[model samples]
Every structure is written in C-alpha cells, then in structure tokens.
Target chain A: LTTREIRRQEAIYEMSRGEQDLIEDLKLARKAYHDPMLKLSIMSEEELTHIFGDLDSYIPLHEDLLTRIGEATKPDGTVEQIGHILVSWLPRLNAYRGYCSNQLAAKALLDQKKQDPRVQDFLQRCLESPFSRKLDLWSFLDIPRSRLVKYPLLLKEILKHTPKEHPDVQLLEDAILIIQGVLSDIN
Target chain B: LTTREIRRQEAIYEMSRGEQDLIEDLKLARKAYHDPMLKLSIMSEEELTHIFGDLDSYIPLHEDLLTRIGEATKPDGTVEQIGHILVSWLPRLNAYRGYCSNQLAAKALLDQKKQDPRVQDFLQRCLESPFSRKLDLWSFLDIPRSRLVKYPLLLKEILKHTPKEHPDVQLLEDAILIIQGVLSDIN
Candidate 1:
C-alpha cells in the first residue's frame, strides 16, 4: 500500500478498534456492576436505576454499531465507505442523552449509597477484580460521555487520511457534523 | 500455526506490547510532570526531588528491557527464550525500591503542593492535555507499582501456553520467581 493508503487504513482500523473497545467497556460495566448487583440482590431495582440508568440498553445499541462497522471494514484493501454506516448509527446515540444528562445525579446517588455497608462491600470486591481494571463504578458510567467525545476526533482522523476525490470524504464530513451536533445537543 | 504455537506467540506478543505500553506511560509521566516543572520553573530542584524521585532514571532502564524483549519476540516463529534476558534485568529492579518505599511521602507532598495556586494551575493544565489521558499525577506515580504487579501475571500467561517439553517453560517459571521476589522485596 502507498503511504496515503496505509494511513487511511490505519484511521479506519482505529475506528473499528475503538468501537470494539467501547463495547467491551460497556459489557464490563454490566458484568462488574449491574449483573453483580442484581444477582447478589445488593440493590433494589429502584436504586439500581438511579445509579446505572438504562445501562443494559446501551450494550445492544453499540453491538449493532460494532457489527455494522465490522462488516464494512472487514474486506481487504482500502476501507469501504464507513461514513454512511456511522451516520445511520446516529439516531441510536439519542439513547445516551438520558445517561449523559443524569450523570451528576447518578454519581451523587452512588456516593450517598456507598455509605451503606452492603453497597460498600460490593464496590470494594468489584475494585479487587481484574476485570475492573482498578476503575470504580463512576468511571464505567462516564464511558458514554468520554466515548461520545471521541467520535468527532475519530471521524476527523479518518477524514484527514481520506483523499479529496475519494467517495467517502463528503460522507465523513457529514458524519462528523451530525455527531458533533448530537454531542452539543446532549450537554 | 498450530494451536499451541499460536497461543505461545500471542502470550509473547502480549508481553512485548505490555513493555512498550509501560515505556509510553513512563514517558507520559516525565512529559506531564517532570519536564513541565523544570521548564516553567514551577518547582525548585529540592521540591522536584521529593515528588519525581529518580523517574528520570527509570526510562532508559526500561528501554533496554523493551529492546531485548522486542528482539526476542520479533522473529517470525515461536518466541525465543526470553526468561534469561528477563533474569539479566533482575538486579536493575532494585532501582524501584526507593521509589516504591517513598510513594506515600511523595503523594503527601503532592497533596500539599497542589494547594499552591501556581502548582494547582500546572496540574490542571496537565490533566487537560490529551497526553495525560485524564489521569492525574498520582496515577502516573502509581504506574510502577501497578506495572510490577503485572509482571508475574504476564509471565504466568506465557508459562500457561508453554508445554512442559518446551525449553522456555522452566525459564518462564524462573523469571516469574525472580520478578515476584523483586516485587516482594520492594514492598
């Protein structure tokens, strides 16, 4: 591959990898927090809702995005047009608006709940797990916001590598604007 | 590659990647903390010594380790015997003893220093940088301890993939023993 082609491939591959990583982080949130809480009866459903805030719903939405991304990028040679695929995923991102807006309230509730002995024990054990990667519950909850901020950067990276005449260039620009708009709208 | 060969290659590759990541993290520490202080004249030399504590010396030591690990794992086949290379680096592990033992004091001093307006400004700027990855100065300082703990886990992973008949098997065990010993000696 020429240098330009190589760079383009790298940019798209980074996007693909980032999507996969976000999915894993989401799963870790469930496995490390939601599932454990439910299975152990550590928190009532109302309390869990206050802290987790529709986290279970996030996984399938991202899984859809990840699957589409994988299919689009898995072919050999230069990347297929991914911007349209990303744009299609935009509406799904509204799912995050509630989570993003509720973050401060969720965090405050968690802080208050941590004073309880049972909740504190659950949190301590979660931290001790290798799967936790030493991150606390709030870090996991913060993933959506952090992950949302990366889209514009990643799209810009892909757009930077993309050639002027390439079919995906305009599409990439459109995707970036829409994602950035979503970001501004939410926060 | 056979399943065993594939697993062994992955195990070794994981270790190689881990060392490189650790090197990048160490550089981030210096870039985000040590150099900024000296360049801006934020902290006096005496105060700098209290916080950074020989971080300048750790880079080259790990660079040497990374180079050998790279050479050992870069060939297109099963991994070379890297345990002896690791064992050769054991004595240098003592370099961390001072840093590990003084972590509490270093942290306390940082806490007090952050209250100063100038130091507070520097820290906030560092946190905002993309290079800092949202980690604070203390997290960077904690890297050595966290990294030391990972050595045993990485070696055990390599060992898990090594068959009893493999020459690297016993060597992996020996390397794990030495690293675990180093970790114990330090803390």
Candidate 2:
C-alpha cells in the first residue's frame, strides 16, 4: 500500500503540474493568439504569420500533453504506462524550444501590435477576465521557455521517489535526457 | 496512425475539461478557504477546526481524483478506467454536497467575523491579489454545487465521443447514473 500510495502521490503532483500548464499557460496563450487573429490592425502581416503560426504549432503539442495528463495512472502505472507517456511526449516537448526562439524574435512585432489601442484594451480585458489570472500578455511569451526548463526538473523530482529496480526510473531517466538534450542543444 | 490520432484527440478534450475544472473551480475554492483561515478574529477556534478542517478534508479526495486523472489512458480507457475514476470520485464528489451546506452556514458566521477592520482589509487584499480573481466569495460557495450538477453532463459528452460498443461507454454510463442517483437522493 505504501508503494502504491507513493506512486499515487507522484501521479497526483505530476498531473497537477501538467494540468496547470495546460489551463494556466496554454489556454491563455491560445486566447492571446486568437484575439489577435481576429483583427488586422492588431496583427501585422509578420505578426499574423508568426504569432498565429506559433500558436498553431501547439495544436498537436498541447493535445499530446493533455492526453498524457488526462489518463488514469493505473496500478503499477509508474513505468509500464507513465514511462511510455513521458517518452511519447518528449518529441512533442522538444518543439517548444524552437518555438521560444521564434517568438522571442517576434517581440518587436508584438510590441508594435500591442500599440494598437484595441489590441491593448483586448489584452487588458483578458487580464481582467474572470476566467484568467491577471497576467500580462508579454509574460505569457516566456511560458514555452519556462515549461521547457521545468521538464527535467519535474522528471527528476519523480526519480527521487522511485528506486533502481523500477523500470519507470530508467524511462524517466531517458525522458530527462531527452529534455536536457534539447535544452543543451539550444540554450 | 488515424486511430492513434483519434485516441489522442479524445483524451486531449477530456483532460482539457478536467484541468479547467481543477484550476478554475478547485484552486479558487482553496484560496477562498485559505484567505479567511488566517484571520484569527474572523475565525473562532472552533471555526478554525471546522472551516480549515473542511478544506483540509479535500486533500485526499482531490488527490485521488488527480491521481486517476493523471494516469495514461489505456487503449480501452474510456469505459473501464475512466468509468472507475468517475465512480470513485462520486463518493468524494458527494462530500462536496455536505461542504456546500456547511459553508453556506459559514456565510452567516463570516459576516460577524468581518466586523474587525483587519479581516475586512484582508479580504479586500485577496480580491485585488494578482493570483486571485475578484470573486465575491459568495459565488465560490456555489462552486461545489455547480460542479455537482455537471458530472452527468460531462460524462454524457464523453459518451458521445465514445463508440456505442466501447468499454468506456458502458462504464461511463454507469458512472453517470451513479452521479445522477446521488444527485437525486441529496439534491
């Protein structure tokens, strides 16, 4: 029961973080892209292509992350199930690093886009929106970068609980390498 | 590939709603309880134990739900696994009904406690806090109630996506009936 309980606690923390990323990060980011996508004045040609394109890339990425997060952690799910889930999402997770670089370059376009009063007001509306936290739109750009950095940290935290004999440890270790590999190549 | 993609999309939407409820509903309810628990004047020693005690009770309930939600969706996940999750959470979910009754009673106690300037300022600070929305605290008490009524609808939505012969469909249907049964008995 202790072994089972420990695994249960791990999955709880793990999914909570994943769900937070989806709800707190991706939902708001999607809104940011979506609101701007509606207005030509709010989004210049470069901004439109870059911003919408960047958000569009997440269609599959977020889907995979949510799928992994939504599933039930089975009995003995640590490695046989969750390890596969972690590895499966690794390739999807790697894409965000490039997305970060692309969007960071679009900061200038974003600044110009924000200059439009309507766009600016729309953003304020979102911050004040009942559904969201009072986050500035600019800070949202850092989300992809922050999530990438946190991947190994989240994985390594789980490893502390599992032991050497556990197959999940190896899978988690491999998943950690996948995250660190991307982080090192880029950062 | 198509079957895999289909499965992925289903879980994405499923988890997406689940994550939204956790973040938007559960997280806020927690803050609602936490912000008031600190005010010594606002809470009698008995109130501290019950109100905070009530909030603390959710830890296990929420954890179980989160654990189930966090696991990877098996191939036949829709019926067997998620159905079980729904059924498991039903007990935990029913507890919310009692919580609703208890907190509604607390609303009366809350007014008397707010007489102190300190507690008044504290609540004002929370409303203005960056992390918190401007919830009236009154609406928050209704959160459990609102969440209670929605279970069957959410399960039905999941059912629509599931094929008629799907294992998830039957289990989910049973879970929905269970939720409705409880709702009927109490509500």
> Which model scores highest in DockQ?
2
TM-score winner: 1
Angstrom error at residue A124, model 1: 3.1
Q: DockQ for all models, in order?
A: 0.01, 0.02
Tens digit of per-residue lDDT, candidate 2, span A18-125: 656655456545544454445536556555645534666675676666656545332122223466777877776556655455666667766776667877676565
Which regions of candidate 2 are displaced past 4 Å? A3-8, A48-53, A75-81, A124-134, B1-187
B-chain TM-score for every candidate: 0.87, 0.70
Q: Report, for every candidate in turn, its global Cα lDDT versus the true structure.
A: 0.72, 0.59
List the lowest-lDDT window of 10 residues for candidate 1 chain B. Answer: B71-80
lDDT of 1 by residue, A1-187 (tens): 4677677777887876777888877766665567667778978877777666676788888889877765554212234578788888876888878767867777787788768898778766655433234445655566667788888898898889887898788888889888978987778
B1-187: candidate 2 lDDT, tens digit per residue: 2454355346535654664565554544444545344544555657544343355565556656655664533222222246667766776566655555565566765666658686677666655533344544544555555656767777776676666666776778788888887876555
TM-scores for the candidates: 0.48, 0.45
Model 2, global lDDT: 0.59
Q: What class would a CAPRI assessor give candidate 1's docking? A: incorrect
